[PDB]
Design a protein around this ligand. Structure first.
Ligand code: CLA
Ligand code: CLA
Ligand code: CLA
Ligand code: CLA
Ligand code: CLA
Ligand code: CLA
Ligand code: CLA
Ligand code: SQD
Ligand code: A86
Ligand code: DD6
Ligand code: BCR
Lengths: 33, 177, 30, 158, 91, 80, 107, 732
């Protein structure tokens, strides 16, 4: 099928990259005032 | 000190007559353990009302398909009049669309179910509540108790029905075949 | 032979599980 | 429904500020993309009718596109798939330039950042977007349940 | 069961345990305990011997009333321990 | 920051203060010891945790004791 | 490198038992043993060994033979030195036996 | 509101260690800021729900992938020839040669050959088509959805259970033994009798007709009349073929014993009877404890009054109930120890008594499963001991355990540690000495001088179980024995032929190599227990550090004073015993794999001759069987084992990289990072990009953890390719 081509890059490159970006930004968020 | 339903067993500590249909019937003590845990009986009462209403609707809709009739038969001509067979014979369109209708109804209900609304009354979803405006609080309690009793009966009835259709294939006084 | 529709309904159930997992994670965080 | 918005915001208090979430800016942008996508699938339908898209049983080869060709796998990629994917890559590149690049002209994507708000809902494009996205979800619903494909459904319904 | 809802049964200082450890059998006399222990051990040994030794146990035919009674050997052990406990408790 | 404590087994040898490379410790008057002094840690925030005080302490077990805790720029001793 | 050099040329070493190069095979195994033994000193720490020595000293004191020269775990610098020395000896001995057995057998 | 919100100290931490310590202390809920016991228990409950959801998602994923991309239907027809497929490969880095090589298993796309035995398990329990696997995957997905909803729900205010409910031990134990164990095992027996035996006998019983089809021709009339032998009458014949009605019986509950001849696996009727009987026993066991009615037992009373006379065991078990029901670490340690013992038991029993059809001839799956479960058993045992140490250093109250059975352990810990040291030293000295003696004797061309000790006691136990080749003639090996006479009519007629048949792994023949390797295993177990026991007992304090409990469980050191205090915290005794866990499980798996490879090849003389010396171990097991792995890819081409070769060298690399963290320590790297900080701050252009957390070298405990993880992961990722690729290449 075409689901492997559609999903493997989506879930192994785009999603983990966005997760790393989100985690980095969140850990670098400073205290509220 | 003693249950009003089972006069040789202790009254359930959680139940105290402050709910509709309270006759001290809790041998196992579900209310007792829930109160020890910390939760209230609002969840179980609202689930009871949900199950009772669904059982009443199911009972009427299961005696009907073969009593007054299986619709004008635009598409239901092929669906078997046996209720346990009809569920595995609904078409994809009607099945999915009944599914999505009940899904949106339940999803709408879920927020007020698990919400923190202090004014929420159990079993008060606003559907058809206009008739309760005229009646008095004693009458309101009587009507809610009648609803609870009918649902309680239907929960057990239906259960019978389903089993009779499963093992015998017909109810005794109705649905001869 | 598993059908495309079968894979799709399984994927829909998986997405529902994903939403519930996100909710559980949020409730665990708070 | 505003109560659900507050419940979300509350839960996810970060995604909220940039407009990502149940926001009017997000609804508007999708709606724009959904209208463009109705136009897009119509364009592909007439292109396939007029045999516009290099098409047929022709398939890529490992010697021309390598491992992305997937030659030897069960998947059989076609040159029509390749060319439409190239068109979508061009669309994505232009979009990425418009989004992460200057707000040269037009409208932002991230709620104009700058601590702007979401303007709760011509300004009927949001209604059209509601139309387009409900049509799209209906199309996937029929393609999944009835199994009658997509271009075929569009052609027979139109 | 809560931690408070428990009798004090520790007997390390004493030479014998209190009869509270027997539970429902706390009030049972030592003579009755001992004679019932002897009867239980004899019956259980007889049942096991007739199930397995005297007749080799066949899967097709097992009595069941011999399987029962074989459990009385542990019961006989408990009964003679309780007999000793009651004898030392003078009860 | 780390927590520096001094127990009453001290014998006023003033060697912990000498071993101290951050001026965290000082001698203060005391009644229990014959030398009339006891170590004290009024500047524990400057502590880095090398435990030279503990190394230099001659008691059978350490009158001066350092418990590592929350890290800071000073405690980590980062020049950057 | 792993297949055509180490695995391929270790044949002359491992197949040396019962021949003149049996000494090279034995030294090969012993050098491997010493290299592995060194990792104990390289990874471990003095506090664990001092506590273990305290338990053993109790066992000896129970029989009234604890020495006047009290036993101690090796210093930290000494543990590092012992680990390094055993590591180097094991490695160099392994290569020594391997090269000598291989070259004497084939050349 | 920094990332470690649960730890204000780490939040104020300005270096990069904040992220590391927050990640590694995220799940240490007991030490979190502003934490209460009730909230701790509720959060643990929710995390348990999420974990169960993850397990069921993993199972559903395996089932779905086999259903969608696996050749289950083709494998069903010819189990002994078709290779099971795990899942398809999607990799844009593969070349045409790689795609061609990985195209296998009778499919048109690259795939991976399953080595988990899931095909055999599902075929045995009665899965015959991809549709059944898909519906099972859907059911597991729905179950995971329900579990996630439950985890969310039980964190709500009105649905948050209380501390008393959590600490209700009697009700939990009653239900988790009578329902979770007992009723679940009864349900599995019902599943076997209703779906698995009919499918093995050639009947398609599914949800649409299991109501109509009777499991037995008699029905429940024998059950209610008490003529229960009718269900054992007419067993399966020795000419039965699995999955076909020819040679099929009607018995549903039997005690034939032995093995099914065609599949060389245990009888499904025997398995159903097993589960039924053990379900009955568990249901009886689960009525022991007092819950709301009067009958039952009080565990506090039992423990309190179990004290032997004259203070033999001190005050007895007084206070143990309080400590166990208060400390979660003791409960965790007991659970981990029990589960590690159970994992070792399943590893030891699956190969000896295979239960799944055609698994005995699937050599790769057997070795993979044994190695897998033995490694997890070692991990669980080390975890049990580590959490016992944490309980001692965190949750132990001497006032409660005033002269307790637990306190006397601390009282004579010196004797315990010294005797563990003695037995470890004795075993190691003499095992290594005998091995080196044999090595030198064979090296000097005189194998006759070897010190070869026959494992007489193990051979005696085999003879007592029913082996006859040794000629001991004891108990079941003796025809005249009363034990043989008593058992002659139920299970011995099958068991004797099964054990004496030489084509099986049931009670393998043993010799001097088995003696020596077993004593090596004893050495390794005793040394691991020595390290772990010493850590647990010295966690509270020591002569070098009597106040260790104040510092806690995992601290770096006490400084260079008093001669040096490296690795003193009793977390470092986990760290150091993990090495011995890897060592002992590696020895065990080497032994299993070699003794089974030779027997599969019909060349057991090679093991019996060469296993008596370490050169033979290095030559005839590692060097000999490493060829098909390293030749996975070479200069001339590549095979399907190229992935396994890559992984062998990758695990080698990870294992070697662990040595860096384990050998080189923090000061060198801190100075190096200071130099790098200077360079980054002083270079132009790049100095505009500036960090937020000050970069620092990894902490001492952090780097010990990282090095140990590299060591362990390299260990497993370099042994798994060997044990799978060599077995696959040799097919024996
Ligand atoms: C209030 C509920 C209700 C009612 C009015 C009935 C009524 C009846 N049941 Mg029953 N039944 C019930 C609940 C109920 N059932 C439930 C809950 C179950 C499942 C436990 C059953 C399962 C059941 C079976 C299996 C059968 C009956 C049958 C009967 C009939 C004879 C039994 C009797 O004395 O009455 C009668 C029409 C018999 C029947 O209808 O035969 C055709 C019959 O065979 N019932
Ligand atoms: C030499 C060892 C020893 C000794 C001297 C004692 C002594 C004692 N135990 Mg026992 N006990 C032991 C071992 C020992 N125990 C072991 C190994 C266990 C674990 C299984 C127990 C479990 C246990 C419990 C759970 C309790 C005691 C209790 C007692 C007291 C009552 C004895 C009695 O007659 O009960 C036995 C009396 C009987 C009538 C027999 C009981 C039933 C038999 C054994 C089994 C029947 C079959 C079974 C239920 C079903 C098949 C499956 C006494 C202080 C009581 C107490 O207060 O403890 C402090 C108590 O409640 N013991
Ligand atoms: C070695 C294990 C062991 C031990 C030592 C005990 C010990 C005891 N159990 Mg038992 N028990 C066990 C296993 C064990 N149990 C198991 C496995 C279960 C699960 C089935 C139970 C379930 C159980 C319950 C539910 C109860 C006990 C109780 C008792 C007490 C019985 C006193 C007695 O016989 O008085 C003398 C006996 C009588 C006055 C009654 C005799 C009635 C007839 C003769 C019984 C015949 C039964 C026999 C098995 C056949 C005693 C302390 C009782 C108690 O009070 O505990 C605190 C109780 O209520 N046990
Ligand atoms: C409900 C569950 C169940 C069922 C349906 C069967 C069915 C069968 N078993 Mg039994 N079995 C069971 C439970 C069950 N077993 C349990 C729990 C055990 C103990 C581990 C055994 C141990 C066993 C053996 C060793 C053998 C069988 C065999 C048999 C066959 C004939 C038995 C017979 O005629 O007994 C008729 C008996 C009765 C109607 C009355 C039984 C009442 C019991 C004794 C009550 C007390 C139970 C006790 C407290 C539970 C704990 C166990 C205790 C004995 C140690 C038949 C296939 C034989 C076989 O198939 O050989 C090929 C055989 O050799 N069974
Ligand atoms: C039932 C299983 C179980 C459970 C529930 C726990 C629970 C716990 N363990 Mg663990 N533990 C287990 C098994 C278990 N363990 C086993 C098998 C071992 C042996 C290896 C250990 C060894 C162990 C040690 C040595 C320590 C703990 C600690 C802890 C506590 C904090 C851990 C933490 O926050 O790490 C959070 C860590 C992460 C989120 C990431 C870790 C990254 C790893 C290396 C890779 C993960 C790959 C996926 C926590 C209560 C700590 C404790 O109590 O300290 C006082 C502690 O020091 N455990
Ligand atoms: C440049 C080297 C390289 C790269 C980048 C990849 C990439 C890939 N290989 Mg691999 N592969 C390589 C070399 C490489 N391979 C070589 C030399 C071989 C030998 C011929 C193979 C043989 C091979 C096979 C046989 C398979 C793959 C698969 C895959 C894919 C994994 C899909 C996925 O989602 O995994 C997800 C990845 C993970 C879960 C691992 C990450 C674990 C993290 C770090 C844990 C901790 C959490 C984290 C911090 C967040 C992916 C495209 C698989 C595939 O096609 O899947 C569809 C597959 O079956 N490869
Ligand atoms: C092959 C490598 C190797 C060897 C031989 C040993 C040996 C030992 N370790 Mg282990 N250990 C190792 C690697 C090794 N370790 C690694 C890598 C680690 C991880 C850091 C550890 C961590 C560790 C700990 C934490 C502990 C041990 C313990 C032990 C002892 C186990 C019992 C025993 O075998 O006594 C018998 C001894 C031997 C087999 C070797 C003795 C020397 C041989 C026989 C030569 C004889 C002298 C020779 C003639 C001199 C010639 C000089 C010229 C022993 C000292 C435990 C113990 O019991 O300590 C007391 C202990 O506490 N080890
Ligand atoms: C004779 C066989 C067994 C008799 C029943 C025992 C009993 O009734 O419990 C004794 C205790 C009461 O004495 C209790 O005695 C106990 C004393 S002590 O706490 O153990 O020191 C304590 O629980 C309390 O004081 C008192 O209520 O509880 C009850 O009596 C009510 C339980 C009876 C109903 C539940 C099960 C019914 C019997 C089970 C079947 C028996 C198997 C045959
Ligand atoms: C827009 C709209 O609609 O607004 C709504 C709003 C609102 C408020 C909801 C309204 C309402 C009211 C509603 C919905 C009322 C619904 C009432 C309904 C539908 C009530 C069924 C009861 C059934 C029972 C008790 C069955 C007993 C069954 C029993 C005990 C049996 O027969 C037993 C038996 O069968 C067995 C088991 C086996 C057989 O062998 C024998 C028999 C047959 C004897 C309004 C105002 O009307 C309109
Ligand atoms: C039931 C319920 C609730 C609800 C609800 C309801 C009814 C929700 C309904 C939601 C609904 C109906 C959501 C559809 C979204 C569709 C989108 C975004 C599609 C975009 C698709 C786009 C932009 C596609 C674009 C293209 O692909 C096209 C077409 C052609 C290709 O060339 C490529 C491109 C990219 C150009 C509450 C109120 C929330 C509370 C509680 O939960 C209970
Ligand atoms: C530190 C600590 C801890 C931990 C611990 C551990 C980890 C342990 C383990 C342990 C173990 C792990 C053990 C085991 C054991 C075993 C045994 C003891 C066995 C026995 C057996 C038997 C008795 C058998 C018998 C028989 C039979 C029955 C049949 C056949 C024959 C024979 C003879 C074999 C805790 C947490 C507690 C806490 C405190 C501290």
């Amino acid at each position: 099928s075409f689901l492997p081509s559609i999903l493997t890059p989506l879930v192994t490159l785009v999603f983990p990259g966005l997760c790393f970006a989100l985690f980095f930004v969140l850990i670098e968020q400073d205290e509220i005032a | 000190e003693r249950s009003a339903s089972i006069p040789f067993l202790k009254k359930p500590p959680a139940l105290d007559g402050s709910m509709i249909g309270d006759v001290g019937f809790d041998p196992l003590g579900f209310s007792t353990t829930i109160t020890e845990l910390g939760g209230d009986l609002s969840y179980v009462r609202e689930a009871e009302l949900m199950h009772g209403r669904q059982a009443m609707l199911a009972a009427v809709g299961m005696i009907f398909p073969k009593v007054f009739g299986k619709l004008p038969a635009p598409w239901t001509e092929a669906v078997s009049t046996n209720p346990l067979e009809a569920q595995y014979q609904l078409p994809p369109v009607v099945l999915g669309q009944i599914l999505i209708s009940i899904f949106i109804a339940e999803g709408l209900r879920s927020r007020i179910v698990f919400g923190n609304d202090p004014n929420y009354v159990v079993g008060d979803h606003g559907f058809g509540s206009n008739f309760l405006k005229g009646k008095s609080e004693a009458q309101i309690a009587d009507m809610k108790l009648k609803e609870l009793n009918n649902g309680r009966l239907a929960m057990i009835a239906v259960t019978g029905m389903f089993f009779q259709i499963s093992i015998k294939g017909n109810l005794w006084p109705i649905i001869d075949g | 032979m598993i059908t495309d529709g079968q894979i799709f309904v399984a994927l829909c159930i998986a997405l529902t599980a994903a939403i519930l997992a996100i909710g559980l994670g949020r409730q665990l965080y708070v | 429904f505003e109560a659900g918005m507050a419940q979300y915001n509350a839960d996810y208090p970060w995604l909220a500020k940039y407009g990502f979430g149940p926001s009017v800016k997000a609804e508007r942008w999708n709606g724009r993309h959904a209208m463009f996508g109705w136009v897009a699938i119509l364009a592909t339908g007439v292109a396939k009718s007029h045999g516009l898209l290099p098409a047929g049983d022709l398939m890529l080869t490992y010697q021309d596109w390598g491992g992305l060709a997937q030659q030897g796998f069960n998947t059989y990629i076609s040159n029509e798939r390749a060319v439409i994917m190239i068109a979508h890559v061009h669309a994505l590149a232009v979009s990425f330039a418009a989004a992460f690049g200057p707000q040269v002209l037009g409208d932002s994507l991230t709620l104009l950042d700058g601590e702007k708000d979401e303007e709760p809902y011509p300004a009927a494009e949001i209604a059209n977007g509601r139309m387009a996205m409900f049509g799209l979800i209906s199309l996937v619903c029929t393609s999944a349940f009835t199994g009658m494909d997509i271009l075929q459904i569009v052609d027979i319904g139109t | 069961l809560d931690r408070s809802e428990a009798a004090d049964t520790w007997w390390g200082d004493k030479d014998y345990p209190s009869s509270v450890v027997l539970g429902i059998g706390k009030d049972v006399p030592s003579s009755i305990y001992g004679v019932t222990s002897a009867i239980a051990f004899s019956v259980g040994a007889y049942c096991i011997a007739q199930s397995n030794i005297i007749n080799i146990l066949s899967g097709s035919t097992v009595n069941g009333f011999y399987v029962a009674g074989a459990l009385l050997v542990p019961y006989s052990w408990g009964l003679h321990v309780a007999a000793w406990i009651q004898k030392q408790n003078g009860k | 920051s780390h927590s520096v404590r001094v127990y009453d087994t001290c014998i006023g040898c003033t060697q912990c203060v000498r071993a101290c490379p951050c001026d965290v410790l000082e001698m203060v008057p005391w009644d229990g010891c014959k030398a009339g002094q006891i170590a004290s840690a009024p500047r524990a925030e400057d502590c880095i945790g090398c435990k030279r005080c503990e190394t230099a302490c001659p008691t059978d077990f350490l009158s001066v004791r350092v418990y590592l805790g929350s890290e800071t720029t000073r405690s980590l001793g980062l020049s950057y | 490198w792993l297949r055509d050099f180490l695995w391929s040329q270790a044949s002359q070493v491992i197949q040396s038992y019962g021949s003149a190069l049996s000494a090279y095979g034995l030294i090969f195994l012993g050098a491997h043993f010493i290299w592995a033994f060194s990792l104990m000193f390289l990874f471990s720490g003095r506090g664990y060994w001092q506590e273990l020595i305290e338990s053993i000293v109790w066992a000896h004191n129970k029989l009234k033979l604890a020495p006047a020269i009290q036993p101690r775990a090796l210093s930290i610098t000494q543990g590092r030195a012992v680990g390094l020395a055993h590591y180097l000896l094991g490695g160099i001995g392994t290569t020594w036996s391997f090269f000598l057995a291989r070259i004497i057998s084939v050349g | 509101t920094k990332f470690p919100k649960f730890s204000q100290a780490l939040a104020q931490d300005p270096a990069t260690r904040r992220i590391w310590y927050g990640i590694a202390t995220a799940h240490d809920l007991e030490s979190h800021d502003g934490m209460t016991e009730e909230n701790l228990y509720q959060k643990i409950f929710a995390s348990h729900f999420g974990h169960l959801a993850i397990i069921f998602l993993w199972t559903s994923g395996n089932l779905f992938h086999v259903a969608w991309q696996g050749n289950f239907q083709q494998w069903v027809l010819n189990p002994l020839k078709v290779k099971p497929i795990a899942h398809a490969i999607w990799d844009p880095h593969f070349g045409q040669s790689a795609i061609k090589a990985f195209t296998r298993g009778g499919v048109s796309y690259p795939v991976n050959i399953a080595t988990s035995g899931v095909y055999h398990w599902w075929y045995t329990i009665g899965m015959r088509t991809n549709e059944d696997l898909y519906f099972g995957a859907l059911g597991l997905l729905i179950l995971s959805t329900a579990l996630l909803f439950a985890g969310w729900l039980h964190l709500q205010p009105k649905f948050r259970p209380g501390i008393a409910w959590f600490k209700n031990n009697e009700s939990r134990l009653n239900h988790h033994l009578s329902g979770l164990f007992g009723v679940s095992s009864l349900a599995w027996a019902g599943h076997l009798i209703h779906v698995a035996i009919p499918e093995s006998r050639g009947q398609h019983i599914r949800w649409n007709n299991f109501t109509s089809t009777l499991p037995h021709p008699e029905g429940l009339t024998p059950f209610f009349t008490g003529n229960w032998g009718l269900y054992a009458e007419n067993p399966d014949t020795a000419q039965h073929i699995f999955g076909t009605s020819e040679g099929a019986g009607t018995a549903i509950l039997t005690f034939l014993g032995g093995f099914h001849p065609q599949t060389q696996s245990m009888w499904l009727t025997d398995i159903a009877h097993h589960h039924l009987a053990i379900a009955v026993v568990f249901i009886f066991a689960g009525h022991m404890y007092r819950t709301n009615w009067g009958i039952g037992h009080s565990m506090k009373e039992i423990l309190d009054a179990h004290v032997p006379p004259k203070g033999r065991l001190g005050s007895g078990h007084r206070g143990l109930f309080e400590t166990i029901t208060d400390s979660l670490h003791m409960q965790l340690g007991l659970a981990l120890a029990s589960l590690g013992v159970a994992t070792s038991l399943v590893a030891q029993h699956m190969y000896a008594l295979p239960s799944y059809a055609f698994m005995a001839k699937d050599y790769v799956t057997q070795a993979a499963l044994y190695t897998h479960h033995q490694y997890i058993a070692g991990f669980l045992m080390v975890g049990a001991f580590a959490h016992g140490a944490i309980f001692f250093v965190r949750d132990y109250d001497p006032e409660v355990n005033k002269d307790n059975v637990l306190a006397r352990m601390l009282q004579h810990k010196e004797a315990i540690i010294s005797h563990l040291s003695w037995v470890s030293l004795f075993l190691g000295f003499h095992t290594l000495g005998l091995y080196i003696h044999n090595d030198v004797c064979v090296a000097f061309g005189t194998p006759e001088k070897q010190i070869l000790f026959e494992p007489v006691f193990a051979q005696f136990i085999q003879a007592a179980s029913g082996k006859a080749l040794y000629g001991f003639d004891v108990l079941l090996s003796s025809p005249t024995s009363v034990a043989t006479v008593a058992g002659s009519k139920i299970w011995l007629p099958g068991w004797v032929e099964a054990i004496n048949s030489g084509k099986n792994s049931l009670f393998l023949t043993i010799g001097p190599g088995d003696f020596l390797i077993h004593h090596a295993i004893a050495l390794a177990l005793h040394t691991t227990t020595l390290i772990l026991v010493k850590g647990a007992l010295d966690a509270r304090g020591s002569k070098l550090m009597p106040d260790k409990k104040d510092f806690g469980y995992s601290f770096p050191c006490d400084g260079p004073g008093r001669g040096g205090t490296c690795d003193i915290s009793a977390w470092d005794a986990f760290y150091l015993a993990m090495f011995w866990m890897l060592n002992t499980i590696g020895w065990v798996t080497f032994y299993w794999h070699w003794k089974h490879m030779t027997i599969w090849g019909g060349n057991a003389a090679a093991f019996n001759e060469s296993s008596t010396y370490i050169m033979g171990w290095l030559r005839d097991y590692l060097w000999l069987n490493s060829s098909p792995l390293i030749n996975g890819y070479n200069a001339f081409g590549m095979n399907a084992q190229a992935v396994w070769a890559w992984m062998f060298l990758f695990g080698h690399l990870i294992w070697a990289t662990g040595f860096m963290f384990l050998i080189s320590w923090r000061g060198y790297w801190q100075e190096l990072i200071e130099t790098l900080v200077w360079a980054h701050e002083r270079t132009p252009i790049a100095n505009l990009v500036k960090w937020r957390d000050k970069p620092v070298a990894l902490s001492i405990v952090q780097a010990r953890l990282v090095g140990l993880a590299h060591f362990t992961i390299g260990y497993i990722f370099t042994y798994a390719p060997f044990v799978i690729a060599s077995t696959t290449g040799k097919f024996s």
